[PDB]
Amino acid sequence: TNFDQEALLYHQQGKPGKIEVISSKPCATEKDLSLAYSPGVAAPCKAIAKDPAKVYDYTAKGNLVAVISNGTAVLGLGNIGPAAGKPVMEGKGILFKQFAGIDVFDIEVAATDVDVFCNAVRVLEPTFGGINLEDIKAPECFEIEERLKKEMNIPVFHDDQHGTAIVSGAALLNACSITNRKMETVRIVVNGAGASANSCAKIFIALGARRENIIMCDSQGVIYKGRTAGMNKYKEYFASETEARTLTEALRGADVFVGLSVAGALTPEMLKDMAKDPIIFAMANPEPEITPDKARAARPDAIIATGRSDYPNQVNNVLGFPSIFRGALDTRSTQINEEMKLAAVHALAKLAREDVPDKVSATYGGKSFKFGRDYLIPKPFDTRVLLWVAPEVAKAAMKSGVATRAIEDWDQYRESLEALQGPSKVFIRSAINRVHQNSAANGGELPRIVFPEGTSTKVLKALATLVEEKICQPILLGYPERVKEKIKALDIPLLNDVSIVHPSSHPKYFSFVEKLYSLRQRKGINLGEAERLMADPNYFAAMMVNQGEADGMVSGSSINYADAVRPILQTIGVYKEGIPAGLNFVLLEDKFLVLADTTVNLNPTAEQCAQIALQAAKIVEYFGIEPRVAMLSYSNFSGAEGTPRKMKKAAEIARSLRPDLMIEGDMQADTAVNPEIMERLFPFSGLKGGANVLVFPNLESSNIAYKLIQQIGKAEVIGPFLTGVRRSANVLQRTTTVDGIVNSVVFTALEAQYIKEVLKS
Amino acid sequence: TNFDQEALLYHQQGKPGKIEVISSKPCATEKDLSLAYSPGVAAPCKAIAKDPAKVYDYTAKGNLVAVISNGTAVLGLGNIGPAAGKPVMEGKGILFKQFAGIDVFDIEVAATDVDVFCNAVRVLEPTFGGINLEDIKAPECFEIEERLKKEMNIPVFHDDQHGTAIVSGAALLNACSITNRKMETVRIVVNGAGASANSCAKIFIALGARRENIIMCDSQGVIYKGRTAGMNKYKEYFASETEARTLTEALRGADVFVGLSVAGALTPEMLKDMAKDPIIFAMANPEPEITPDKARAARPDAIIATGRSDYPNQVNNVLGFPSIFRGALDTRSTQINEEMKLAAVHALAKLAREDVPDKVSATYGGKSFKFGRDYLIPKPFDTRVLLWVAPEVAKAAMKSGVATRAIEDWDQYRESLEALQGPSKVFIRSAINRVHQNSAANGGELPRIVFPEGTSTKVLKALATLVEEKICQPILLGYPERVKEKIKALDIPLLNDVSIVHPSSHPKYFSFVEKLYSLRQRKGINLGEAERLMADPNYFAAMMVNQGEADGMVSGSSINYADAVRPILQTIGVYKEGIPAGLNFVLLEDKFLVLADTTVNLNPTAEQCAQIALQAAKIVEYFGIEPRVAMLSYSNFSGAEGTPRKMKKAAEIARSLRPDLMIEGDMQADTAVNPEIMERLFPFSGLKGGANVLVFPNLESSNIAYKLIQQIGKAEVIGPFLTGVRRSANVLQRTTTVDGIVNSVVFTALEAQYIKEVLKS
């Protein structure tokens, strides 16, 4: 197949393999290496000698999980060797890292004797914080893990053994709550005796199922006690008292079919004879025991789940292990025990019922999902999985006493969990915590924010995520029923209760058209034009804000930047000495840089540049950071006629206005951001410690700079945001994504709170 | 100590540990993971099943080396455990990666029985391409490696056993060539019986030393045959027929002292009694058997070497293992054998004699080094090490038959080796190969290039590296003896034979001042001013170029950009329709982007922007790449009055001039570089596949853009370079580093060849 060859080149091209190792600390100099190695590395070693625990503080143990296998059960290809099994392992590690931020070593072992293999593995224990076995044959595997969990004082976990059980377990919980079943009256039939089969029962049972109501099958029919044909010590756990000997006889009147075998194993004939509301987990690969459509054909009352990505309810293990190993690892647990595996099932099934975020609908091509028969388990790609599962896993490991380190700030824990991908995401979270902070100080009151484009798909979808973060109270504009149509159209019930206002219909409408009239009658407006402009949701919004009928507004999700910025300016205006200006954030590992003005003024004058900068400094001072400002130029201090003079004189004005602040010009870009270049070449410069605020000499330089950093800099950039207006106001771009719309709203809310506080004085 | 605590926070802060694992292939989408894992990963596995060899083609084996230890000998702290020994290992891996680009897993093993440990290690063989043991006690270690090298069909190597031997071995070779000794008449005394001692002899001997002339000591004196006090099976290798029982009796008349013990072990008394020209390797840590100054005190004829970084001849293993494992790994060798270890000693000692590059002098604070008594071995930080050692290691492994894959293009091999750090470095190497390519087609003739600032430290030092790459024939300007003074002052004898010209003294001087006269008498020059301006090296250079007395020039390593660009323009001029323009390269993983004009024109007109671009396209077409051009703006196609109109009309002109080329405007930045944004929003745009040539609307935008990418983009940027002049000419900045000066010269040479070729037509 072309797909086969595409896989081959994926692995082969460029750097062969799928993994690489890098340093987590600087490693450039005589000094850097004199820290990471001799003579420096002695200091941690000695400290680990005196207290072994500290091995987690100075080393990578705390995040290092080994994926180990002998390649005696790779995927569905079986015992194909340790060599051929390696890529699958590299990949399993990739999954670890991408889904829970966990670093992983692939270890391919050449021993098929249970004892060689264990004697080899157990002695790796100081290396890893946790051990993930994968793709090892039955029944050897059971002997190996059962032994190892006992042997080693770190967690040991065979993913193929327990994953399927945990996800299909959460799934069963849900289906059972759905169909009003009780676990203790559920009959469960397991066809198949692979790695997974044995643990499925352990778990359903652990969730409350009666083992008498559980029948288990293999390639030779029902497993009845005393059957000797093809048994091992481990299958012997779940033999039934039943007289049924064929699968079919077992599935007669059965409530749930746990299908762990091959396709076609489940006939429409057996389906006709299962209980009312049959729960069917057909997880055979690549093809299920029966297709969902063929099953809905025999019994429309059937609930169906597979491991395939193109059918509903994809049962993929990745819902499981990453979140789990994570939670374990963070508490420095000694095991992954049953308390924990169950806590994980309970978390997955709990998360499943929450309204499906538009980020997730997005991952799967806009398809809407609601908790039900077609959504039993969170989609494998929910970014919330980790946030919901890992903390409960740690919570369990602490409650069960296998943990050696206690997590106290739960919220903090989750925060770090989000933080895992996104140096920007962390920033917006700081931001939101800081909205909540002065929110709760002024009565828990939330800033009122109007969204003129009330039928905007993107604005709505953003709002959705917005409310459960309790950022703002949303007011949309348009015809109330033509927007509730779009809320019901987007399956977004999160926000069924928000204010929806038609301009022309609102009581203060006329009071408004009069107030616009006097503000603009001598600027080209008669009494008629003000009536018709106030009918524009934008002008209606702004006027709402100016009068205090709302604390802020945001639009421009549908309109050109300009077209959307003008009514704001004509209604709200700027405060004394203000200038309208667009500002960006560039987010690095430590600091962030502020870029302006990137949307508004075409070729700003010196006075104007000094004001842009001063505002940018009030904004950075808001976050408790010392603002450092550079008026950018093509020259290093020339004062030459033209741009340099404008910028030099600009900085001079800015200092004239705020003498406590470090401000300079004119200077090139690199000369700005880098304090080393500054001290080496222009030691006279008042700017040291590198600039954190970059003012551009004109619009060409700033728009090209910000969009070029965004595309090439591979550092993350948010914005642009609007500044300098009398009231909390902000313009989006049409190209704005939903994320953009929600953080933009956050800033709007904050500045609003800041407006209220400037009022209090 | 404050240093101890600084080490602690180095390891503890941010992400605990010192290592992380990432993916080497994209991993973002349903598609990305459907390749790296199921169902895709089946395709490599099946392929490895049919031919095991292919495990190197689709997996990370080919670059994966395990550093393994039980922590029974960590540094000088001894048997402190597998746990405490981990950080030292993480660090050893860091070294692997940083010095030879080798990925490394740290494996800390809890077994002190030779047999547990080996039985555990050998079964890891499918995982790694090679095995590095480190810091394991004697004599267990000998049993373990001696066993393992036999056991496993991948290389096994205990670094502490052989490193010291290999580096101190190259070092001995040199000292022996220096003092005109022959190995077979050398007497060698080894004090100490650590890991290293045993292999030292193996190697000196393998280099030609007679074992009868070798005496070996430990904590109980000389090792004589039959002494039973404190022996093991392995010390028994090198017992001597000698009657000396104390160290002192051994060192009487000894030629070389191999000191592997503790400080003070070597008295001035014993020193008085060693042979003429005593070679002293005192490598005890942290303090040597004797300080170099205390040793030079007793015997000034003594050659001395330590493992300390602040004394000459630092013997650090890093000269050894990285280069070695590299060369092995690339040939898919089954061992690291003696043929190879020796080939490595021969490479290190050969490299030691090459003139010391200014990059290396730079690493150590400008100190100059020449092969001699104070430089026996390349400095640990020579970037050449790898380039010289690894290919010879592979060469040996192929000649000795332990290899399973043959390297043919040796040059290519080295090229890739350089390439290892530097996506820009690879580019300049392409460039140089391409200078050599049309050089060898026009008679091996090299472009003549004049360097007016002939006393420039940086220009000289650059030239040094330049010649051995045979790029150009350098002509310097200044007073001949005042520059040969600076060549002798910089210990840079590489270039003792280059043309050195005083302007005023040269025969064509007057012919020149006359030709300047008529070119500029009606532009403010009398006959006198031309005499005195031609006395300026710059004008002298340019005039040399204009007349064909040289093929090109470069300066501005000392002068302001402008001040240095003016004489060029006044003498050489531009060709028909030319515009003077500064251009940069941005280097990514695949493509590169071209930025202009970043130094010259302040606010270029439309006609001018179209010409800047056209030139930039001749330049990108030169490298066989399809040029894609965007006239950058703050707008997406507004044609609005102002910048957008200028740029839109600009592109329109550029197409009017070269209709085969993909050129567009006006457009924002991101809209340019990203073909996806282009197809989604402006599908009408003639520009698809993302822009690779970015023309700026003015100087503010371009200087701020390029210097901002350089500082934040963390993609690499070279330049600025000069374009559009009639002849090969180029201006440096004062801030230019030596690297900058040498690649700048390369381009100058090339354009010169391109000038010659345009002439041929």
Numbering used by the authors:
A (entry chain A), B (entry chain A): 16 to 776
What is written in the article reporting this PDB entry?
Bacterial hybrid malic enzymes (MaeB grouping, multidomain) catalyse the transformation of malate to pyruvate, and are a major contributor to cellular reducing power and carbon flux. Distinct from other malic enzyme subtypes, the hybrid enzymes are regulated by acetyl-CoA, a molecular indicator of the metabolic state of the cell. The larger ME isoforms (hybrid enzymes) are predicted to be a fusion of two unrelated enzymes; a catalytic N-terminal ME subunit and a C-terminal phosphotransacetylase (PTA) domain. The PTA domain is homologous to PTA enzymes (that interconvert acetyl-CoA and phosphate to CoA and acetyl phosphate), yet they appear to lack critical catalytic residues and thus acts as a sensor instead.
We used our Br−/urea protocol to successfully obtain a full-length apoprotein, MaeBapo, from which we were able to determine a crystal structure at 3.70 Å resolution. Loss of acetyl-CoA causes a dramatic change to the ME:PTA domain relationship, mediated via a remodelling of the L1:L2 helix interaction. In MaeBapo, L1 sits directly under L2 (helices in the same plane), replacing interactions made by the hook region in MaeBbound (helices ~120° apart). Thus, the MaeBapo structure reveals a requirement for L1:L2 complementarity, with hydrophobic contacts at the interhelical turn (A434:V441) and polar contacts along the helical faces (R444 and N448 to D426/E430/E433). Resulting from this large-scale rotation, the ME hook subdomain is freed from the clash with L2 observed in MaeBbound, and is now located under PTA d1 where it is able to adopt a helical conformation identical to that determined for the isolated ME domain structure.
